[PDB]
Design a binder for these strands. Structure first.
Ligand code: T1C
Ligand code: T1C
Ligand code: T1C
Ligand code: MG
Ligand code: MG
Ligand code: MG
Ligand code: MG
Ligand code: MG
Ligand code: MG
Ligand code: MG
Ligand code: MG
Ligand code: MG
Ligand code: MG
Ligand code: MG
Ligand code: MG
Ligand code: MG
Ligand code: MG
Ligand code: MG
Ligand code: MG
Ligand code: MG
Ligand code: MG
Ligand code: MG
Ligand code: MG
Lengths: 76, 137, 57, 115, 96
RNA sequence: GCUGGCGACCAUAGCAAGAGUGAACCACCUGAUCCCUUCCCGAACUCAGAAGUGAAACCUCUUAGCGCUGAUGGUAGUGUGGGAUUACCCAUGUGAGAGUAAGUCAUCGCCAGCU
RNA sequence: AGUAACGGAGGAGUACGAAGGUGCGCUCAGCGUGGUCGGAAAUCACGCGUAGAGUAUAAAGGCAAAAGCGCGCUUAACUGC
RNA sequence: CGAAAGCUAUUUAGGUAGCGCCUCGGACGAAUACCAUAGGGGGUAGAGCACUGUUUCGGCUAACCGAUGCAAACUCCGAAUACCUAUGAGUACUAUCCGGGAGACAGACUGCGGGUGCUAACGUCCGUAGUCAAGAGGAAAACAAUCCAGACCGCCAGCUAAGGCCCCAAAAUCAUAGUUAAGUGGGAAACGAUGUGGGAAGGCAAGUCGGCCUGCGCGGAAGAUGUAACGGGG
C-alpha cells in the first residue's frame, strides 16, 4: 500500500470566448486562477479573477503596458 | 558508482529515448574521445567499470573526463509480486544515451595508447561506440 | 468557370472522417466515379486533403 | 528624482482609476514657484483646456502661494466651461489634497466645474 | 590555396526533403553571406569539402568558391556535422 | 533651439562610460510664525519665500563594451499517404529553438512657456 | 475543455469583528561597507538591489493601482433583486 | 433503418437510473458539415539553462566567473496538429426542436501518444484512429481485430485492387543492368574474420602496403512424436 491516490475534480478553466467573437454584456470570457489576463475596456473582473464582458461588442486580446500584460477588451 | 546527492523526486516516468545527441557531441575537454553511435541506457556500474579499465590502462598519465552522469532512477518490483500495489523500488541509476554522445574524453595521452584504452572500454558497454578526435570546426 | 475532372481511384471506406467528408463534398460516390468541379481554392483544398485516393486531369 | 519618483508612484493609482472610468480629468501640477492645471480628455492625449501662473495676468504678480492657486482655479474653471467641459475628475497627481491644491480645486468648484 | 567548385542551389532544392535528396547524392548545401551582397545558396561536393576540412589552413585562409564563371572569396564560418556519423551536413561562408 | 506637463509605444528605446545646460523653467535651496505633517525627526508631507548654486538630481548629447533586436541557410519536431519497428525512412505540406551575418545609444502626438 | 490505474507527490474537515470596508501612506529579500556588547545571521547609517521577500494555511496560478505592509474612521461579513 | 460495451450515481461493480449512441412520428429547412480565407488563446513535441533542482572540469577565497550536460511534477523560448468564431464557393435531407419505443453501460485487436511492468506478456490502464463486435468476398498456407474491398438478385461477359505470373494453381521459364554461392533467400545479438562487390583518400615504388565508408554474404546458432524456421515440389 502506497500513499498516493488522491486528486481533485476538474475546474474547467480557460478561455471561453476567443478573439473576434461577439459577446453580450455579462458573457464570461476567461476563467483563470490568477490574472494571466487583465481586464481592458468594457471588461470586468470577478472575485475569483473571472473576466466578463460588461458591454456588447467583439473580444480583442492585446499585449499592453510596460509590464507586457495580456489584456482582454471588448470593442463596442 | 555515481549518483545524485539528492533529487526533487524519488521515482520517475519511463519516457522514450528518441532523437540524436546534438549537444554533448563535440570533443571539448581533451584530445581524444569515445562517442556512442547507438542508443541506449548506461548504468552507473557500467560507467564505473569503463572508467576503471581506461584508467588502469593509460596508467594515470593524462586526465579522463567522464561526460555522462547517471541521474535517472530505475525501479524494479521485488521478485514474486503481482502487478498492482504501486510503483516498484529504486534499484540503480542510468544515463540516457543518444547516438553522438561523448562518454569519455582523454587529455594528455598519445593517440595509440588512448585508442587501446578506448577499445578496452568499449567491451564493457551495451552500445556500439567510435573513437573521435578533436577538430576545429 | 474553368472546371477540372476528378476521379476516385481508391476506397473511401476506412479513411478519416474528414477525408470522407471531403470526398462527399466534392461529389464523388464510388471508386471510378468521375465528377467535374469548378477550379477554386475551396475545391482545391478538398482535393489536396485526399490527393492519395483521387486522380485529377 | 526620489521625490518625483515616489510622487508619480502615488499618482498612478488615481490616474489608472480615472482612465478606467473614462472621464475628463483635471490634472494639477505644483512646483515651489508655480502651479498648473490641465483639463485633459478621457483618452489622455488631448488637452481640452489649461491654466497656470504663467498667463500675463498672474506672472507679473507673485506665484506659488494659496492666492495665486485660487486665481488659477478660477481661470481654469472659466476656460474649461468655454470648451464645454463640466464634469471632471480631480487628479491631485500625488500631491496631498490639502493646501494650494485644495485652493485650486475650491476655486474650480465655485467657477462651475462639477466634481 | 583552396578552391571549391559549387553549383547554384535554387529554391525547390531548399527545405528538408530537397536537402536530404542532395545529401543522398553526395552533396552538401551551403550558404554565403557577408559584405553587402545578399546570401547565395550553393551545392558543394562532399569529397572536395571533406578533403579540404582535413587541413588547418582551410580554417585560417581565404578560400574561393566558383558557382560557375563567378569567383567568390570567402572564409568558412560554420560547419554542421551529422551527430553520429561525423559527415558534414551544411557549411556557412562569410564573404572575404 | 530649449524647457515643463499629459499621452502613444514598452529595451532597435536599456545599462555602462564619458560631456554639457541656469534667460526662463526645473531642481537643490532659506525658514517654519500660520494651515498641515513625524509610531522620534520640517527627512518626507505642508506652508511662507527668493540670498545663492547647477554641486547633487533631472534633462540633453556622444560611445556597440554589455544587454536587446535579428535574418539567410541548415537542423530538430510535425499533419496526411506509404514503408519499416526501437523511433526511423520516403512523397507532399509545415517548420523551430539555439547559433551566425547584421541592426540598435528610439519614434510619435496634444498643450503651455521661454528664447 | 475532459481523460484511468492498489500511477507519482502533497494538503483539507479551519481561521479572522479584524486578518472585513474605505481613505491616506509605505516597499521588500538579499548583498557590501561602517558601528556598545553584537558574533556568519538582531537593531542603526550609507550604497547597490537582477523579484530571489511576503501572502492565516498545501500547491499552482497571481500580486505595483501591489493582492504584500501600516495608520484614521468604520460595519457593504447589508436587505430586495 | 440500425447501436453500445461510455460518463455520472448507486450496500454499486455480471443489476439499475439520467445523459451519450439507435429508431419512428411531427415541426422547421440550410440554421449544419466538409474546404478556402480571416481572426484567436495556448505551453505540448522540439529546444534551452533565464528560474528551481541536478551535474563535470578549470579559475578565484564558499559565493562568483569561463567552459560543459540533464529534467513528468524546471522554462528565457516554442511548433505541427487540434479547438473556437466570422465570411464565402460547391457538394450533401444536414442541423435543431417537440413526442412514442428501445437496446446498451463484460468489449477485443492493430497503429500512433503515454502511465505501469522487465522500454515482458494474446498483460494492464488511459487518449486517438481503424477494424471486429454487427461484415461476406480477394491476399497473408491455414489465420475475428492485418492489407485490398463494403455482398439487392441473375449471367459459361469485360476492366481492375491488394497480391501475384516454373509446377501443385490463373497469369512472364518476359526484358535490360547489377549482386549473392550462404539454399543466404526461407528465424536471432555482442563480438570475430585477406568472403565478395563498390566509393573516397593515403603511404612506398614489378606493383605493393593497411586505414576508413558502404552493398550482399559467413561464424556466433543446442531439445525433446516426424523432415518440421520457403505451404510443398523444386
Ligand atoms: C521601455 N523600457 C526600456 C522602459 C522604459 C522606461 N522609461 C519610461 O517610460 C520613462 N522614461 C523615459 C521615457 C525612458 C525617458 C522605464 O521607466 C522602464 C522601462 C523598462 C521596464 C522594465 C521593467 C521589468 N518588469 C517589471 C516588467 C523588469 O523586470 C525590470 C528589471 N530590471 O528586471 C525593470 O527594470 C522594470 O521594472 C522597469 O523598471 C522598467 C522601467 O522602469
Ligand atoms: C516590485 N516592483 C515595483 C519591481 C521593482 C523593480 N525594481 C526596483 O525595485 C528598482 N530598484 C531600485 C530600488 C531602484 C534600485 C523590479 O526590478 C521588478 C519589480 C517587479 C517584479 C515583477 C516580476 C513578476 N513576477 C515574477 C512576480 C513578473 O511576472 C514579471 C512580468 N513582466 O511578468 C516581472 O517583470 C518580474 O519578474 C520582475 O522582473 C520584477 C522586477 O524586476
Ligand atoms: C530594459 N529593462 C528591461 C531593464 C533591464 C535591466 N537589466 C537587468 O536587470 C538584467 N539583469 C539580469 C542579469 C538579466 C538578471 C535593467 O537593469 C533595467 C531595465 C530598465 C531600466 C529603466 C530605467 C529608467 N531610465 C529612464 C532611467 C527609469 O527611469 C526607471 C524608472 N523610472 O523606474 C528605471 O527603473 C531604470 O532606471 C532602471 O533601473 C532600469 C534597469 O535597471
Ligand atoms: Mg508574469
Ligand atoms: Mg495606494
Ligand atoms: Mg518529409
Ligand atoms: Mg529556416
Ligand atoms: Mg530563428
Ligand atoms: Mg526582471
Ligand atoms: Mg444500412
Ligand atoms: Mg426526423
Ligand atoms: Mg522533451
Ligand atoms: Mg456497470
Ligand atoms: Mg464497464
Ligand atoms: Mg477500454
Ligand atoms: Mg489485452
Ligand atoms: Mg455481443
Ligand atoms: Mg472479412
Ligand atoms: Mg477473407
Ligand atoms: Mg484461403
Ligand atoms: Mg486484365
Ligand atoms: Mg498455369
Ligand atoms: Mg529469362
Amino acid at each position: 500500500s502506497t500513499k498516493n491516490g488522491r486528486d481533485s475534480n476538474p475546474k474547467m478553466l480557460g478561455v471561453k470566448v476567443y478573439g473576434g467573437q461577439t459577446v453580450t454584456a455579462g458573457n464570461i470570457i476567461v476563467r483563470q486562477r490568477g490574472t494571466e489576463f487583465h481586464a481592458g475596456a468594457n471588461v470586468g473582473m470577478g472575485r475569483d479573477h473571472t473576466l466578463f464582458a460588461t458591454a456588447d461588442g467583439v473580444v480583442k486580446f492585446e499585449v499592453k503596458g510596460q509590464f507586457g500584460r495580456r489584456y482582454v477588451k471588448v470593442e463596442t | 558508482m555515481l549518483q545524485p546527492k539528492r533529487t526533487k523526486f524519488r521515482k520517475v516516468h519511463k519516457g522514450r529515448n528518441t532523437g540524436l545527441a546534438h549537444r554533448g557531441s563535440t570533443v571539448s575537454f581533451g584530445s581524444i574521445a569515445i562517442k556512442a553511435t547507438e542508443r541506449g541506457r548506461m548504468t552507473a556500474r557500467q560507467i564505473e567499470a569503463a572508467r576503471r579499465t581506461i584508467s588502469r590502462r593509460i596508467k594515470r598519465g593524462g586526465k579522463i573526463f567522464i561526460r555522462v552522469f547517471p541521474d535517472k532512477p530505475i525501479t524494479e518490483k521485488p521478485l514474486e509480486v503481482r502487478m498492482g500495489n504501486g510503483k516498484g523500488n529504486v534499484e540503480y541509476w542510468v544515463c540516457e544515451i543518444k547516438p553522438g554522445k561523448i562518454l569519455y574524453e582523454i587529455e594528455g595521452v598519445n593517440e595509440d595508447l588512448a585508442r587501446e584504452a578506448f577499445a578496452l572500454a568499449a567491451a564493457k558497454l551495451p552500445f556500439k561506440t567510435t573513437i573521435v578526435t578533436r577538430t576545429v570546426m | 468557370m474553368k472546371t477540372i475532372k476528378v476521379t476516385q481511384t481508391k476506397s473511401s471506406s476506412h479513411r478519416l472522417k474528414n477525408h470522407k467528408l471531403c470526398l462527399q463534398g466534392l461529389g464523388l460516390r464510388r471508386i471510378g466515379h468521375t465528377v467535374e468541379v469548378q477550379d477554386t481554392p475551396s475545391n482545391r483544398g478538398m482535393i489536396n486533403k485526399v490527393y492519395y485516393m483521387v486522380s485529377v486531369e | 528624482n526620489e521625490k518625483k519618483q515616489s510622487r508619480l508612484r502615488r499618482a498612478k493609482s488615481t490616474r489608472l482609476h480615472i482612465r478606467a472610468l473614462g472621464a475628463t480629468r483635471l490634472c494639477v501640477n505644483r512646483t515651489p514657484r508655480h502651479i498648473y492645471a490641465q483639463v485633459i480628455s478621457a483618452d489622455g492625449g488631448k488637452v481640452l483646456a489649461q491654466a497656470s501662473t504663467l498667463d500675463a495676468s498672474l506672472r507679473s504678480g507673485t506665484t506659488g502661494n494659496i492666492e495665486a492657486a485660487t486665481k488659477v482655479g478660477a481661470l481654469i474653471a472659466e476656460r474649461a466651461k468655454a470648451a464645454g467641459v463640466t464634469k471632471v475628475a480631480f487628479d491631485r497627481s500625488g500631491f496631498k489634497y490639502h493646501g494650494r491644491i485644495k485652493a485650486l480645486a475650491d476655486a474650480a468648484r465655485e467657477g462651475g466645474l462639477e466634481f | 590555396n583552396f578552391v571549391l567548385n559549387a553549383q547554384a542551389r535554387a529554391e525547390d532544392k531548399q527545405g528538408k526533403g530537397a536537402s536530404r535528396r542532395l545529401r543522398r547524392e553526395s552533396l552538401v548545401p551551403a550558404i554565403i553571406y557577408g559584405g553587402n551582397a545578399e546570401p547565395v545558396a550553393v551545392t558543394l561536393e562532399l569529397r572536395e569539402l571533406v578533403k579540404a576540412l582535413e587541413s588547418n589552413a582551410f580554417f585560417e585562409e581565404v578560400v574561393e568558391i566558383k558557382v560557375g564563371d563567378k569567383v567568390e572569396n570567402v572564409k568558412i564560418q560554420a560547419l554542421q556535422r551529422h551527430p553520429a556519423k561525423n559527415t558534414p551536413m551544411h557549411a556557412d561562408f562569410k564573404r572575404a
